[PDB]
Amino acid sequence: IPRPVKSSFREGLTVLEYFINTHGARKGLADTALRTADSGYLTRRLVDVSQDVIVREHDCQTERGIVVELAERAPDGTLIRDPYIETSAYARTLGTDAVDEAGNVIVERGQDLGDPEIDALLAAGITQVKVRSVLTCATSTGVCATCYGRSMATGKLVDIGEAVGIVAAQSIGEPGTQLTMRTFHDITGGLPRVQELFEARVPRGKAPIADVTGRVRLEDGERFYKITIVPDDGGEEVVYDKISKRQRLRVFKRVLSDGDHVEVGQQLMEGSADPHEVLRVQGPREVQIHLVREVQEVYRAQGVSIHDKHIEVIVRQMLRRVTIIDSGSTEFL
């Protein structure tokens, strides 16, 4: 309202100013009620999704696992701590070891990786560690123990009967409610965004992504844009057909300029794209990283601490099945 109100509640509001405040008050309250319904519904669905993730074995004894960002490098050159480490690194078990400058091992395989040890790694001057996760646990039915890392409730290693799937369900779906969406209007971020991301519904505001590296063939067509990717091998130019001018180009590091070299799956515009497409381009690893980073982006935006292993359980449940394109000669439609 462009008036705007100009009286503190100590001074006592005037009639019209109070009448204006009533709008926002009632709107917020009704939104609270409806969103509470929605969040309960999301928790309901997730619980059934992750009802069968229960720790069975003590150790799957694999060697695959994810890498963690863990205090990326400074330009002038230091170890500036990554702000979101407590959610992404702690309570994890290493599959590999920490060695640097052909030196000695720092942390050996399979350690809880708590505060003293992270302090040791940052002192020694390493940035990336390959750590286990529930995404690559090789057990048949449910995760092993060492993949799930420290149980965030006990402070000790998770037990061999825990229903970590439902624990993650409640942790993810509990801190809804206090989840007011973004202040901005076509922009979409909030509990609806979380819901669509888990639902895998192609985001309504799809932001086209790349398909191969090379420089960009940029053009501003009739009342909207026309982009194309120049291949490098090359091959067929992926020509992006209609790109409405109601969007923006992606700014990173500078705005997207013509001739700039793009990645294989670089996001061309600014927005979001279908996890289906980023799958078919950059594989299960990239989709899992994308999903965890996106969801944690919202929960960070509201300043809520959720360890990434819960989301990892859920996405592990997401990425189980495969599709049959050729039957071979056996029983698969």
Partner 1 sequence: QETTRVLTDAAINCRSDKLNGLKENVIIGKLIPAGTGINRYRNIAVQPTEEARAAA
Partner 2 sequence: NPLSGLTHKRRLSALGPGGLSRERAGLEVRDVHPSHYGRMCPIETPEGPNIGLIGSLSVYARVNPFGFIETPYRKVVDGVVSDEIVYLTADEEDRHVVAQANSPIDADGRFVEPRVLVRRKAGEVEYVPSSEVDYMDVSPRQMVSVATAMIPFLEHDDANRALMGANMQRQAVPLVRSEAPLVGTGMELRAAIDAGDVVVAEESGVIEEVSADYITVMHDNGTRRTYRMRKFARSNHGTCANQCPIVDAGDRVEAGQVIADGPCTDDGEMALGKNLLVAIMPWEGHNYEDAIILSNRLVEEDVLTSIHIEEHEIDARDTKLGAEEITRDIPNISDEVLADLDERGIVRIGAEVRDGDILVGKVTPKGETELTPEERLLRAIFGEKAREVRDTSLKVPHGESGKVIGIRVFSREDEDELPAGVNELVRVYVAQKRKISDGDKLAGRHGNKGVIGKILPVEDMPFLADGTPVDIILNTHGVPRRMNIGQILETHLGWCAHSGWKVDAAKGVPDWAARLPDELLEAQPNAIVSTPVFDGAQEAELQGLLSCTLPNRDGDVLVDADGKAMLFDGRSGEPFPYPVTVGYMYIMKLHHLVDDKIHARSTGPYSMITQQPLGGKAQFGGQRFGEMECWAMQAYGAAYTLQELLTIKSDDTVGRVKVYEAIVKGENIPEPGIPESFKVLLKELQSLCLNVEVLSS
Partner 3 sequence: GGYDTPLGITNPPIDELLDRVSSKYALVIYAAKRARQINDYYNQLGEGILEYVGPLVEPGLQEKPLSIALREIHADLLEHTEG
Q: Which residues pair with 272 in a beta bridge?
A: 206
- The minimum distance between CB 151 and partner 1, in angstroms, equals 13
SS3 333: coil
Residue found under tokens 């439609």: 333
Q: Answer with the entry of partner 2, Zn ion, partner 3, none that 160 interacts with (C-beta below 5 to 8 A by kind).
A: partner 3
Q: Which of 77, 83, 116, 161 binds partner 2 (CB under 8 A)?
A: 161
Residues 62, 96, 127, 170: which binds partner 2 (CB under 8 A)? 170
Choose the stretch contacting partner 1; rule: CB under 8 A; options: 9-17, 101-109, 122-130, 158-166: 158-166
Is 222 a known ligand-binding residue? no
Beta bridge partners, 216, equal 229
* Residue 162 engages partner 1 in binding (rule: CB under 8 A): yes
Task: Return the range that interacts with partner 1 (CB under 8 A); candidates 110-118, 156-164, 277-285, 298-306.
Answer: 156-164
Q: CB burial class (10 A; 0-12, 13-18, 19+) of residue 163?
A: middle
Residue owning tokens 């071979």: 328
Which residue among 60, 71, 91, 216 contacts Zn ion (CB under 5 A)? 60
Nearest partner of 136 among 63, 70, 87, judged by Cα: 63
Distances (CA, A) of 297 to 178, 189, 191, 289: 15, 10, 12, 12
- Given a contact cutoff of 8 angstroms between Cβ atoms, the answer to whether 291 and 274 are in contact is no
What is the footprint of partner 1 within residues 49-78 (CB under 8 A)? Answer: 51-52, 54
Interactions with partner 3, residue window 159-198 (CB under 8 A): 159-161
Rounded to a whole number of angstroms, the minimum distance from the CB of residue 93 to partner 3 is 17
User: Which residue from 22, 140, 183, 323 is in contact with partner 2, where contact means CB under 8 A?
Assistant: 22
Give which of 177, 109, 201 is closest to 146, Cα–Cα: 109
Q: 50-73 burial, b if ≥16 CB within 10 A, otherwise e?
A: beebbbbbeebeeeebbebebbee
Which one of partner 3, partner 2, partner 1, none interacts with residue 29, CB within 5 to 8 A by kind?
Answer: partner 2
Q: In this chain, which stretch among 46-54, 62-70, 197-205, 227-235 interacts with partner 1, using CB under 8 A? A: 46-54
Please name the residue that has the structure tokens 């590091």.
253
CB of 136 to Zn ion, least distance (A): 7
Q: Where are the alpha helices (DSSP H) in the chain?
A: 15-49, 115-124, 164-173, 191-199, 275-301, 308-318
- Select from partner 3, partner 1, partner 2, none the partner in contact with residue 52, using the beta carbon and a kind-dependent cut-off of 5 to 8 Å: partner 1
The reply, when asked if residue 60 is annotated as ligand binding, is: yes
Query: Per CB under 5 A, does 137 bind Zn ion?
Result: yes
Interface residue list for partner 2 (CB under 8 A): 1, 3, 9-16, 18-23, 25-31, 33-34, 40, 43-44, 47, 161-163, 166-167, 169-170
